[PDB]
Amino acid sequence: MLNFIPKRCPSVSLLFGKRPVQRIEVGQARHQLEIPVETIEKIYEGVDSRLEYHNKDYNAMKWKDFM
Amino acid sequence: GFHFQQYIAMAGRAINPVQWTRAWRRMEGKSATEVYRDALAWTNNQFAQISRASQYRAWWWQNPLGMGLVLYGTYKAWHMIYMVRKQKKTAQLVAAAYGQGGQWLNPVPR
Amino acid sequence: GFHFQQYIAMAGRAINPVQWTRAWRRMEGKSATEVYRDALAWTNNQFAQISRASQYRAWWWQNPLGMGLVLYGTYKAWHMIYMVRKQKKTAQLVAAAYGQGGQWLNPVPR
Amino acid sequence: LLGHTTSVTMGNSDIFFLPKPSNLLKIALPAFVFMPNLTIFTRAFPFYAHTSA
Amino acid sequence: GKIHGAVWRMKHLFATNFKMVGHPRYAYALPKNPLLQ
Amino acid sequence: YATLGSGWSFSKVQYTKYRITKPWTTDTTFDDIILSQPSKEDFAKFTKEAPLFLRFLKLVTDVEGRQEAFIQFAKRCENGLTVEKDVYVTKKELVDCLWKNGYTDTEINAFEIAFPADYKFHYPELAVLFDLTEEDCYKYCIRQRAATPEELVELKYTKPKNLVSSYGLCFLGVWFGLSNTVLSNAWFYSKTFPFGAVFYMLGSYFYRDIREKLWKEEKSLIHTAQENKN
Amino acid sequence: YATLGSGWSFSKVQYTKYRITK
Amino acid sequence: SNTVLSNAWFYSKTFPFGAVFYMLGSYFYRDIREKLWKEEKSLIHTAQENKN
Amino acid sequence: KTLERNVPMKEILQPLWVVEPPNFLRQPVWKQFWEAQFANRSFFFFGNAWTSAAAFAFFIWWSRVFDPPPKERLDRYWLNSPKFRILSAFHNPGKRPGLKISLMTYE
Amino acid sequence: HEQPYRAFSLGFTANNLSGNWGDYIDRQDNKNALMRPARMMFTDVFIPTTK
Amino acid sequence: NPPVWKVNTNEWLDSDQYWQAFVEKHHFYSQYQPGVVDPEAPQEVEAF
Ligand SMILES: CCCCCCCCCCCCCCCCCC(=O)OC[C@H](COP(=O)([O-])OCC(O)COP(=O)([O-])OC[C@@H](COC(=O)CCCCCCCCCCCCCCCCC)OC(=O)CCCCCCCCCCCCCCCCC)OC(=O)CCCCCCCCCCCCCCCCC
Ligand SMILES: CCCCCCCCCCCCCCCCCC(=O)OC[C@H](COP(=O)([O-])OCC(O)COP(=O)([O-])OC[C@@H](COC(=O)CCCCCCCCCCCCCCCCC)OC(=O)CCCCCCCCCCCCCCCCC)OC(=O)CCCCCCCCCCCCCCCCC
Ligand SMILES: CCCCCCCCCCCCCCCCCC(=O)OC[C@H](COP(=O)([O-])OCC(O)COP(=O)([O-])OC[C@@H](COC(=O)CCCCCCCCCCCCCCCCC)OC(=O)CCCCCCCCCCCCCCCCC)OC(=O)CCCCCCCCCCCCCCCCC
Ligand SMILES: CCCCCCCCCCCCCCCCCC(=O)OC[C@H](COP(=O)([O-])OCC(O)COP(=O)([O-])OC[C@@H](COC(=O)CCCCCCCCCCCCCCCCC)OC(=O)CCCCCCCCCCCCCCCCC)OC(=O)CCCCCCCCCCCCCCCCC
Ligand SMILES: CCCCCCCC/C=C/CCCCCCCC(=O)OC[C@H](COP(=O)(O)OCCN)OC(=O)CCCCCCC/C=C/CCCCCCCC
Ligand SMILES: CCCCCCCC/C=C/CCCCCCCC(=O)OC[C@H](COP(=O)(O)OCCN)OC(=O)CCCCCCC/C=C/CCCCCCCC
C-alpha cells in the first residue's frame, strides 16, 4: 500500500463521516468488509498536513505510523 | 474533398509498368463504353460521398471556410506544379529565341 | 503543442500600446519575484496540459510522428522568420563592406 | 593611433543555457572517456598504455 | 534518465507487494512476528 | 495535471481522420475541461426538471427532520432548476460513494428504484440532499468530471479575439518567412524532404509495432502490481 | 448517397479541434 | 521551385483576401449558418405540421 | 444557501510541476559532484561519468588553449576571420574597414 | 611560423573547404562550373541583380 | 489508494522515506550502478 490518505473534507471525499461505518471491496473476488469510522479516524491523528499529493487530495502519514 | 492519399497511390500504380501489363490483361473482352461508364461512376461515387458525409461528418482539415479552402489548395497546387513549370519553360524559350521580354516588344517603327 | 492562436493573440495584445498602460497600472504593488513566478507557472501549466491531455486526446494535427512535427514546424517557422532575416541583413552588410563573400576571403599573401 | 587600434575590444555573445528535461527520458545514455585513469596502476601506465582491451 | 527508470520500476514492483516493507537483505533488523512459533 | 481515476485499466487510444462533432448551438461550444480551465460563468446553464428529484427530497427531509430546506429549495426550483450544464455526478458514482461511506442498503435501494440509471445529479441537488455546501459539491463534481475528461464539456460561446493584431502579425510572419529560398533549396530537397518523408513513411507503416514494443514493459509492470495487490 | 432515416429532426453539427479517439 | 509564395501578387491579393475571408468566417461563423438555414427550418416545420 | 462566487479551476485542479525536472536523490548538484569525487572511477576528470565530463570542461576552460590570442599573434588567424570581418562591418555601419584592418595587421 | 592561417569552418551543415573565394584582389567563384548555373539553390536568401 | 501507475513518481518517492534511502545509496553515492530495480540482488552481486 501507499502513504496516500484521502482528505476527509467533503470537497474531496463526499460523505465521509455522515454514517458510522466504512466499506471496501477486497481482492479480485472483491469481498466486502465493513470498518468502524473511529478505527479509520485513528489514522488522521498520524496524518501530516504539510504534505499533500495527487491534486492536493491526499495527505501523508508519518513514517513511524505508516510502517 | 477526401482521399488525397488514395489518389496519390492511384497515380503511383498507374505509372507503374507492371500495372500496365495488368491493365492489358484486364482489357480483354471489354468495351470503351464500359470503361467510360466505370470512370464516370467512380467520380460520381466520390462526389456523392462528399455530398452525403458533409452533412454529419468533419475531416481533420475542417475550417470556417469548409471545403472551399481544400479546393483552393488543390487549385494552387495544380497551378504551381504544372502552369508555373510551363511558364518557366516558355520563359527560357522566349529568352533564347528573342531575349527576355521578346514577346512583348513593340512593332518595328515605320 | 497547443493554443497557437492564443499565443498570436497574446503577442498582439503585448504590442498594443493601450495594454502597456494597463500593465503599468497592474504593476502597482507588485514584485519581480511575483512576476517571474507567475510567468513560470503559466509555462508549467501549458506543458502540464500537454503531458496530461496527450494521454487521451488527439488534436486536428495528429500524425504518426505526433507533436514532433508540430515542434519541428515551430522551429522551422522561427528559423525562417528570424534567422534567415538576420542572414539577409548580414549578407547585405558584408556585400556593402567587402563584397559578396568578403568574410570568407583568404588572407593577404605574404 | 598606430598602436591603439588592437586595443578596441568587444566581448563575445554566447549564452551557455539549455533546459535539461530528464522527466522525458527513462534510459541511460553513453558517455565518453576523456582521459586515462592514472589513479590506478600508475606505475605500470607507460607499460600497458599501448595495449587495447 | 537512468534514475527515473529505476524509480519508475521500483514503484510498480515494490509499492503494492505487502512483502517488501524494506529490502530483504536487511530483514534481520525487523521486529519479530508474534504469530510465528 | 494529475491523472485522476480509480481504474487499473491500462488504456491507450488510436486516432481517426475525423473530428468530434456535437449538435449545433448558437450560444454554446464544446471543449476539454483541462485545456479550457473553465470557470463557473464560463460554464453553460440549462433548466432541469425538478419533480422526480423533489419527491425523493421530500421523503429524505421528512426523515432527517429539516423541511425548511425542502421548502426553500422547491420555491427556488419551481419553473425548473437553472444550473450549470456539465457539472454533475452520475448515479453509479454516487451509489459507490454512499456504499463505501456506509449508507444502508434500504437507502441505496431507495435511490436505485427512484432514479433512472442515466440520471445526473447536480451540485445543488447534492447540497440540499446531504446538507453540504454548494461550493464543496461543485468542487466534487468537477473532480469527478475531470476523472473522465474524454467527455467534452459545454461552455458559453465567445467570439474570437485580437483578430486584427493577429492578422498583422501573420502578415509580418509570411513577409519575413517566405521572402527566401528556403523551400527551393538543395538542402531542402536533399535532407529535409527525404529525412522527413522517410520518418513519416516508417512511422505510418510501423505505427503500431513501435507503440506495442514500447508499451510492453509498462503493461507487464501494471499487471505485476495489480496481481501483488490482489 | 441517399439520406436514410425515419427522423424529422433537422440536425446540424458543429466541429471541435479534436479528433475522434477509440 | 518558384517565386510564387514571395510575390507581390501573393502579399497584395492572396494573403489579404484569404485572411479577410478567414477572419470574417471565424467571426460570423454562426450568424451566416443561421441566416442560411432559416428557410429550410421553416419549410421542414411547415411540412411536418401539414402532415400531422 | 446558493453559490454565487465565480469559482476558478485553479482552486480545484492543481497542475503538476514539470518545467524543472525532479530530483529523486533530494541532493544538490554540487553535492553530487563532491560525492562522486570519493566514489571509485569518478575522480576529477577520470571516468565516463557526467562529473568527469564537467571536470574535463572546467579543465580545458582553466587551461589557456581556448583563451584569446595575444597581439603578437592576432594576424595569424583573427584578422582574417569571418567573425572579425562581420563584426567590424557591423560596428562600422556605412564604411569599409579593409584599410583599417590592413593597418591593424601592420600594427 | 610567420605565414598566416586560413579560416576553418567544418560542420554537418556547412563548411569552407569545398571552395575558394580568393584574396581581396584576385577573387574567384567558390562554386564549380556545373553548379554555377544553379547558385540560387545553395542559398538561404538571394538578392538578384538590377537590369 | 489511487492506482500506482496513475500516481506521479516523485510524489510516491516523497511519500516513501525508505526507498529514498535505497536510491541515494546506489545512484547518489555511486555513478556507475545499473538502472535496475534491485541492484543488491544475487544476480547482480555474482555478475559483479
Ligand atoms: C503559407 C503556409 C506556409 C507558411 C510559411 C512557410 C513555413 C513552413 C513551416 C511550416 C510550419 C507550420 C507551423 C506549425 C506549428 C503549428 C501551427 C498550427 O498547427 O496551428 C496553426 C494555427 C492554429 O492554431 P490552433 O491551436 O490549432 O487553433 C485552431 C483554432 O481553434 C481553429 O480551429 P478550427 O477547427 O476552426 O481550424 C483549425 C485549423 C485547420 O487547419 C487545417 O486543417 C488546414 C486548412 C485546410 C486543409 C489544407 C491546408 C493547406 C492548404 C490550405 C491552407 C492554405 C494555408 C496553409 C496553412 C498552413 C497550415 C496547413 O484552422 C487553421 O488553423 C487555419 C489555417 C489556414 C489559414 C488560411 C489563411 C488564408 C490566408 C492565406 C491565403 C491562402 C493560402 C495562400 C497559399 C499558401 C500556400 C503555402 O493556425 C493559425 O495560423 C491561427 C489563425 C488565427 C487567425 C489569424 C488571422 C488570419 C491570418 C491567417 C493566416 C494564419 C497564419 C498561417 C499562415 C498561412 C497562410 C499564409
Ligand atoms: C511543403 C508544404 C507546402 C506545399 C508546397 C506549396 C503549395 C502551397 C499550396 C498548399 C495546398 C495544399 C493542398 C491542399 C489539398 C488538400 C491536401 C490534404 O489535406 O491532404 C494531404 C494528404 C492527406 O490526405 P488525407 O485524405 O487527408 O488522408 C490522411 C491520412 O488518412 C492520414 O491520416 P492521419 O490522421 O494520420 O494524418 C493526417 C494528416 C495531418 O496533417 C496535419 O494535420 C499537418 C501536420 C502537422 C501540423 C502542422 C502542419 C504544418 C507544419 C508541419 C508539416 C510540414 C509539412 C507541410 C504539410 C502541408 C499540410 C499541412 O497527415 C498528413 O497528411 C501528413 C502531412 C505532413 C507530411 C509531412 C512530410 C514530411 C516531409 C517534409 C519535410 C518536413 C517539412 C519541411 C518544411 C516544409 C515547410 C513548408 O497528405 C499527404 O500528403 C499524403 C501523404 C502520403 C504519404 C506520401 C509519402 C511521404 C511524403 C510526405 C509528403 C506528402 C506531400 C505533401 C508535402 C509536404 C511536405 C513537403
Ligand atoms: C526612436 C524613433 C522611433 C520612434 C517612433 C516609434 C513608432 C511608434 C508608432 C506607434 C505605434 C506602435 C505600434 C503599435 C501599433 C498599433 C497596433 C495595434 O495594437 O492595433 C491593433 C488594434 C486592435 O485590434 P484587435 O487586437 O484585433 O482587437 C482588440 C480590441 O480592439 C481591444 O483593444 P484595446 O482595448 O486594447 O484598445 C482599443 C483601441 C485600439 O486602438 C489602437 O489600435 C491603438 C493605437 C494607438 C496608437 C498610439 C501611439 C502612441 C505613440 C505615438 C504618439 C502619438 C501621439 C498621441 C498619443 C496618444 C494620445 C491620443 O481603441 C479602439 O479600438 C477604438 C476605441 C477607441 C478607444 C480609445 C483609444 C485611445 C486611447 C488613448 C490613447 C492611449 C495612449 C497610450 C499611451 C502610449 C504611451 C507610449 O486594431 C488595429 O489594428 C488598429 C488599426 C492599425 C493602426 C494603423 C491603421 C492604419 C494606418 C497605418 C499607418 C499608415 C502606414 C504607415 C505610413 C505612415 C507614414 C507616417
Ligand atoms: C591539418 C589537420 C586539420 C584536421 C582538422 C581537425 C578538426 C579540428 C580539431 C578537432 C578536435 C576534436 C574536437 C571535437 C570535434 C569538434 C566538433 C565541433 O566543434 O562542433 C562544431 C560544429 C559546428 O561548428 P560551426 O563553425 O558553428 O558550424 C556552423 C554552424 O554550426 C552552422 O549552424 P546552422 O546554421 O547550420 O544551425 C544549426 C542548428 C541546429 O540546431 C538544431 O538541430 C535544432 C533543431 C531542433 C528542432 C526540434 C526542436 C524541438 C524542441 C522545440 C522547443 C520548444 C519550442 C520553442 C520554439 C523555439 C525552439 C524551436 O543550430 C544549432 O546547432 C544549435 C545547437 C545547440 C542545440 C543542440 C541541441 C542538443 C540537444 C540534444 C538532445 C538529446 C536527446 C537524446 C535522446 C536520445 C533518444 C532517446 O558542429 C556542428 O556540426 C553543428 C551541428 C551539430 C549537430 C547538432 C544537432 C542537434 C539537434 C538535436 C535534435 C534533438 C531532437 C531529438 C529527436 C529524437 C527524439 C524524439
Ligand atoms: C587536489 C584535491 C582536490 C581534488 C578535486 C576535488 C574537487 C574540489 C572542489 C574545489 C572547487 C574549486 C572551485 C574553483 C572555481 C574557480 C573559479 C574561477 O573560475 O576563477 C578562475 C580561476 C582560474 O583562472 P585562470 O588561471 O586565469 O584561468 C583562466 C582560464 N583561461 O580559477 C582557479 O584558479 C581554480 C584553480 C583550480 C584549477 C584546477 C586545477 C586542475 C589541475 C589538474 C591536475 C594537474 C596535475 C599535474 C601535477 C604535476 C605532475 C608532475
Ligand atoms: C574522436 C576522437 C577525438 C579524441 C580527442 C580527445 C583529445 C583528448 C586530449 C586532451 C587531453 C590531453 C591531456 C593534456 C595534459 C598535458 C599535461 C598537463 O598537465 O598540462 C596541463 C595543461 C594546463 O596547463 P595550462 O595550459 O598552462 O593552463 C594554465 C592554467 N591556467 O593542460 C592543457 O593544456 C589542457 C589541454 C587541452 C586539450 C585540448 C582540448 C581538446 C578539446 C576536446 C573536447 C571535445 C571532445 C573531444 C571528443 C571526446 C573524446 C573522448
Side-chain angles (χ1 to χ4, degrees):
Chain A
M1 72 218 78
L2 313 176
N3 193 0
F4 283 68
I5 316 309
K7 295 195 183 186
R8 57 179 152 174
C9 307
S11 81
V12 175
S13 78
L14 208 77
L15 317 163
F16 174 66
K18 297 290 184 185
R19 257 55 166 171
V21 185
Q22 292 273 310
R23 312 204 178 93
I24 54 174
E25 281 164 326
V26 188
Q28 195 75 354
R30 295 170 81 69
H31 302 131
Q32 281 85 351
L33 184 77
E34 298 189 27
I35 298 144
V37 74
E38 297 83 19
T39 291
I40 302 306
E41 277 170 11
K42 196 261 190 163
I43 289 156
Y44 292 96
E45 311 308 318
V47 164
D48 195 300
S49 48
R50 298 144 154 280
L51 311 169
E52 40 175 7
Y53 308 112
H54 203 253
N55 206 42
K56 296 181 200 324
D57 294 339
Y58 293 77
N59 287 114
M61 307 172 70
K62 297 142 191 160
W63 191 248
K64 196 94 185 297
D65 305 310
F66 182 65
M67 184 53 70
Chain B
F2 70 111
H3 289 169
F4 303 109
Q5 188 160 322
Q6 295 184 5
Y7 306 154
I8 307 318
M10 285 165 57
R13 288 193 294 272
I15 57 174
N16 196 357
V18 177
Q19 291 283 343
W20 299 351
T21 65
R22 220 168 289 185
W24 184 256
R25 286 185 223 104
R26 270 193 276 105
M27 274 205 266
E28 188 64 279
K30 184 62 67 65
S31 176
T33 52
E34 296 184 30
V35 170
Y36 174 77
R37 283 198 282 88
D38 284 3
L40 205 66
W42 186 83
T43 312
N44 185 73
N45 193 40
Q46 298 294 300
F47 284 112
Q49 281 175 63
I50 296 169
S51 304
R52 177 54 171 126
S54 311
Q55 294 160 359
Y56 66 90
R57 187 145 303 296
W59 285 262
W60 65 266
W61 47 253
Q62 212 73 44
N63 74 89
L65 309 178
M67 67 186 79
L69 201 62
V70 165
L71 298 169
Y72 162 77
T74 309
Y75 159 80
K76 175 64 76 172
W78 166 83
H79 187 263
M80 274 207 267
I81 294 162
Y82 172 75
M83 183 55 68
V84 173
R85 171 65 178 176
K86 187 166 64 152
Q87 285 171 355
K88 197 191 182 134
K89 302 206 256 174
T90 312
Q92 295 191 85
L93 181 66
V94 171
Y98 311 99
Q100 184 57 36
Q103 74 282 26
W104 294 117
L105 293 170
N106 305 340
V108 181
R110 285 210 77 188
Chain C
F2 70 111
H3 289 169
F4 302 109
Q5 187 160 322
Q6 295 184 5
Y7 306 154
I8 307 318
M10 285 165 57
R13 288 193 294 272
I15 57 174
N16 196 357
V18 177
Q19 291 283 343
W20 299 351
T21 65
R22 220 168 289 185
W24 185 256
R25 286 185 223 104
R26 270 193 276 105
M27 274 205 266
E28 188 64 279
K30 184 62 68 65
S31 176
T33 53
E34 296 184 31
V35 170
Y36 174 77
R37 283 198 282 89
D38 284 2
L40 205 66
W42 185 83
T43 312
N44 185 73
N45 193 40
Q46 298 295 300
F47 285 112
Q49 281 175 63
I50 296 169
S51 304
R52 177 54 171 126
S54 311
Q55 294 160 358
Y56 66 90
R57 187 145 303 295
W59 285 261
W60 65 266
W61 47 253
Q62 212 73 44
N63 74 89
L65 309 178
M67 67 186 79
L69 201 62
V70 165
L71 298 169
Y72 162 77
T74 309
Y75 159 80
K76 175 64 76 172
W78 166 82
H79 187 264
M80 275 207 267
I81 294 162
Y82 172 75
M83 183 55 67
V84 173
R85 171 65 178 176
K86 187 166 63 152
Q87 285 171 355
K88 197 191 182 134
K89 302 206 256 174
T90 313
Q92 295 191 85
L93 181 66
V94 171
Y98 311 99
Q100 184 57 36
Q103 74 282 26
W104 293 117
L105 293 170
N106 305 341
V108 181
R110 285 210 77 188
Chain D
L1 285 52
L2 172 45
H4 302 280
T5 53
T6 58
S7 308
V8 171
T9 43
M10 301 211 79
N12 211 35
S13 57
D14 201 82
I15 290 164
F16 305 111
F17 179 73
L18 190 65
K20 195 193 81 67
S22 52
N23 49 24
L24 295 165
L25 198 73
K26 287 179 192 173
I27 58 168
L29 300 175
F32 296 89
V33 181
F34 296 99
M35 287 267 270
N37 210 335
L38 311 176
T39 69
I40 193 177
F41 314 133
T42 313
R43 205 183 74 147
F45 168 75
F47 307 94
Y48 74 79
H50 66 279
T51 81
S52 30
Chain E
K2 188 175 78 169
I3 297 157
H4 196 303
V7 180
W8 176 72
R9 295 181 181 98
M10 276 178 207
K11 182 170 73 165
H12 287 91
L13 302 186
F14 296 167
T16 47
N17 202 316
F18 297 80
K19 306 178 59 43
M20 298 193 71
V21 309
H23 196 256
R25 275 176 68 92
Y26 305 90
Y28 62 88
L30 281 178
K32 296 185 264 192
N33 199 341
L35 316 178
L36 300 188
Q37 57 92 52
Chain F
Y1 287 79
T3 313
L4 317 180
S6 305
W8 275 86
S9 198
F10 176 76
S11 82
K12 293 284 190 191
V13 293
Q14 53 168 319
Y15 63 91
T16 74
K17 59 177 284 194
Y18 311 119
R19 288 202 205 191
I20 289 156
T21 53
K22 297 285 193 208
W24 182 264
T25 57
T26 178
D27 48 349
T28 66
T29 196
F30 290 79
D31 206 339
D32 189 79
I33 189 163
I34 283 151
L35 293 170
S36 283
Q37 292 292 307
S39 291
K40 204 188 155 278
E41 317 314 300
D42 293 332
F43 273 107
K45 288 196 153 176
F46 81 98
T47 58
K48 195 199 185 156
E49 291 295 320
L52 174 50
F53 172 74
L54 284 177
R55 214 168 291 117
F56 194 80
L57 181 71
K58 196 192 167 39
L59 171 52
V60 165
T61 48
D62 209 21
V63 174
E64 279 206 51
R66 56 203 175 86
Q67 301 83 351
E68 309 323 300
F70 168 78
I71 302 299
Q72 188 189 356
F73 185 79
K75 290 193 297 192
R76 172 185 166 187
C77 185
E78 55 99 28
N79 289 259
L81 192 66
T82 306
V83 67
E84 285 77 350
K85 179 149 177 72
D86 289 89
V87 181
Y88 64 85
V89 165
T90 58
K91 178 176 179 67
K92 209 192 81 63
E93 295 163 4
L94 186 61
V95 167
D96 293 331
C97 193
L98 296 165
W99 182 82
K100 81 176 164 183
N101 283 289
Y103 284 71
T104 68
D105 293 333
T106 63
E107 299 167 280
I108 290 155
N109 199 4
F111 274 94
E112 286 175 347
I113 65 187
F115 297 95
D118 61 317
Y119 205 72
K120 298 197 269 198
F121 303 83
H122 293 76
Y123 64 96
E125 301 177 26
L126 295 172
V128 69
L129 194 72
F130 300 113
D131 212 347
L132 296 172
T133 53
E134 284 197 358
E135 206 176 49
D136 287 87
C137 291
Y138 176 86
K139 296 191 184 179
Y140 185 79
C141 285
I142 291 282
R143 282 171 228 263
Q144 296 295 125
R145 290 303 100 221
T148 72
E150 299 90 3
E151 292 214 41
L152 304 177
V153 307
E154 197 165 345
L155 274 76
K156 289 180 191 297
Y157 180 66
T158 49
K159 297 286 194 77
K161 271 176 201 296
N162 312 120
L163 302 105
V164 184
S165 299
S166 303
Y167 164 78
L169 288 171
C170 283
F171 179 86
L172 206 56
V174 296
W175 169 255
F176 293 141
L178 291 167
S179 290
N180 52 48
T181 317
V182 162
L183 308 177
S184 298
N185 261 0
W187 177 268
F188 186 75
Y189 295 126
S190 298
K191 308 291 163 46
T192 307
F193 180 86
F195 281 73
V198 166
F199 299 152
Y200 190 88
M201 284 197 302
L202 292 177
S204 180
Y205 198 78
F206 304 108
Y207 183 73
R208 316 208 157 183
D209 303 77
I210 292 160
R211 299 295 193 291
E212 292 157 20
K213 202 155 166 182
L214 293 174
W215 301 339
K216 198 188 283 174
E217 197 193 15
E218 182 147 27
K219 282 172 78 70
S220 77
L221 291 175
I222 289 153
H223 181 280
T224 290
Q226 196 169 27
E227 296 290 337
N228 288 352
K229 191 203 177 77
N230 299 135
Chain G
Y1 287 79
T3 313
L4 317 180
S6 159
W8 275 86
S9 296
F10 175 76
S11 178
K12 293 284 190 191
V13 293
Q14 53 168 319
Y15 63 91
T16 74
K17 59 177 284 194
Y18 311 119
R19 288 202 206 191
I20 289 156
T21 53
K22 297 285 193 208
Chain H
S1 290
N2 52 48
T3 317
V4 162
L5 308 177
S6 298
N7 261 0
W9 177 268
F10 186 75
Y11 295 126
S12 298
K13 308 291 163 47
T14 307
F15 180 86
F17 281 73
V20 166
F21 299 152
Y22 190 89
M23 284 197 302
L24 292 177
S26 180
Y27 198 78
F28 304 108
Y29 183 73
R30 316 208 157 183
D31 303 77
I32 292 160
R33 298 295 193 291
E34 292 158 20
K35 202 155 166 182
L36 293 174
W37 301 339
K38 198 188 283 174
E39 197 193 14
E40 182 147 27
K41 282 172 78 70
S42 77
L43 291 175
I44 289 153
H45 181 280
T46 290
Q48 196 168 27
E49 296 290 337
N50 288 352
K51 191 203 177 77
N52 299 135
Chain I
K1 201 197 84 183
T2 297
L3 183 61
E4 58 259 30
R5 178 168 90 79
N6 189 3
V7 187
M9 187 61 84
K10 66 187 171 170
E11 300 188 358
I12 297 150
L13 302 177
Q14 306 293 324
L16 290 170
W17 208 251
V18 305
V19 172
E20 60 203 49
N23 193 353
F24 301 111
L25 312 177
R26 302 291 198 267
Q27 293 279 35
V29 166
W30 64 267
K31 195 181 279 289
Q32 298 179 35
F33 183 84
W34 188 241
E35 200 74 50
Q37 304 305 296
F38 311 97
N40 193 32
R41 307 163 48 211
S42 288
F43 197 57
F44 179 62
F45 56 73
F46 307 115
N48 46 321
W50 77 261
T51 57
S52 302
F56 186 74
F58 176 80
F59 175 61
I60 62 176
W61 180 85
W62 175 72
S63 178
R64 66 182 91 171
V65 294
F66 290 109
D67 297 353
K71 301 191 182 196
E72 56 171 80
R73 213 196 303 151
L74 284 170
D75 66 303
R76 201 80 191 276
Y77 193 99
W78 174 242
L79 305 177
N80 309 107
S81 178
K83 186 168 164 66
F84 167 72
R85 287 164 173 164
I86 288 161
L87 264 70
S88 308
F90 181 81
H91 291 287
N92 297 274
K95 295 142 192 303
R96 291 179 66 81
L99 192 58
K100 302 302 194 168
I101 289 161
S102 295
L103 296 167
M104 286 164 78
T105 313
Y106 194 96
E107 179 195 333
Chain J
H1 64 269
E2 283 283 309
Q3 293 208 273
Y5 289 135
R6 187 176 173 265
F8 194 78
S9 168
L10 179 53
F12 285 79
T13 47
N15 61 78
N16 70 316
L17 321 173
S18 58
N20 192 43
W21 288 255
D23 319 299
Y24 196 96
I25 315 189
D26 283 4
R27 305 215 181 174
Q28 63 196 75
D29 201 330
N30 50 318
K31 302 294 179 199
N32 60 303
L34 304 173
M35 42 167 66
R36 271 168 220 158
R39 193 195 305 285
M40 195 194 199
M41 288 165 61
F42 309 97
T43 65
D44 268 322
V45 285
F46 202 87
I47 292 153
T49 62
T50 302
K51 200 86 194 72
Chain K
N1 285 135
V4 77
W5 69 270
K6 278 176 163 65
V7 170
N8 191 241
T9 315
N10 212 27
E11 283 179 347
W12 171 71
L13 205 78
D14 194 1
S15 86
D16 187 83
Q17 284 288 329
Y18 187 88
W19 300 113
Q20 270 191 34
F22 194 80
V23 169
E24 206 192 1
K25 193 203 165 141
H26 294 287
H27 296 116
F28 169 72
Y29 287 104
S30 194
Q31 296 282 124
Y32 300 115
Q33 287 289 83
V36 295
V37 61
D38 206 338
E40 291 187 353
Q43 289 76 236
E44 289 76 357
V45 172
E46 185 55 43
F48 186 84

